[PDB]
Structure formats: C-alpha cells, structure tokens
Design a protein around this ligand. Sequence first.
Ligand SMILES: [Mn+2]
Length: 179
Amino acid sequence: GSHMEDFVRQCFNPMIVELAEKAMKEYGEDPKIETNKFAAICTHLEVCFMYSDGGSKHRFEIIEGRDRIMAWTVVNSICNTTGVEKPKFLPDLYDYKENRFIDIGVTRREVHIYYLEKANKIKSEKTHIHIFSFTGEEMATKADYTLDEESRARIKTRLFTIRQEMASRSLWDSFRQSE
Ligand SMILES: [Mn+2]
C-alpha cells in the first residue's frame, strides 16, 4: 500500500485508472508495485485523450486506450484504407486531416532527448512525434504541432499540476528519478 498508488486513484479519473490497470496487466505489471509506471500510464492516457479533444469533431481516430488486439485491428483498417505505411509500434492517434499516425510522449526530461529516443525507436519515418514535458515544453516532428496553441497549453498546464500534486506529497523526486 504505497502513497503513490492512492495518489494516482485520487488524481485521475476512474475510467483512466481502469484503462491504465488493464494496460499494465496485459504486460504482466502490477499497479501496486510498479507505482511510478501506473502514474505514468495514467498521465499518458489522459494527455492523449485531451489531445484528441483538440481536433475538429472527426479529426482523430483514437488508438491509445483500446485493447491491444483491437488497437492493431484499427491501425490495420487505417493502413488498408488510406495506403499509409503500417507502424512497427502502436501509435496513439491517427490524424485524418494530415493523414498520419501520431505518437504522443510525455517526459520528465529534456524533450529533445526523449524525442530522439522515440525517433530512433519507432524508425517509422512517417509516424508524427509530439512530446510534452512536465516543465511546459513541447517538441514536434517538423516543428508541426498539429493543434492550435490553446489545446496544447491546457495539456501543459495539467502536466504541471500533476507535478505540483506529486511534489506536495513528496512523490515527485522519486517519480522524476524513476523515468
Ligand atoms: Mn505515446
């Protein structure tokens, strides 16, 4: 029974917590033990959903938060109907306006570092990358930030609020250090 576990359950909405639990079980991880990861997964879920709310109404197909098999099934429907290249790793959204997959990343470090690490890892030239930090910074493929500034600014504000709530509990240093 960690403080972090109870913190996560009061910080995030029940639907996010439940999806995060599922995600972690699917890879045999335990939200009661790997509590920093549980927090990180909830955070990544919420940001991806906030992000998808920034479009016009039918802009994005939402990939993140599906069951893994369904998620690949939908990716495949998109590849098959648009001709776009199949990614090697599950992206978070598909942008029907710009016709590209997006992978949203959230980092407790300098953005370019995580950018780079995600760029080399996906190796999907095509998949757009958009990183947010917990210090208000962002970095996106080709400096193309996809949404208007307001939709991105509120994500930055929410991440900073999570950071504060964690710091006020003395959980921040250890979450930051566990990345
Ligand atoms: Mn992501």
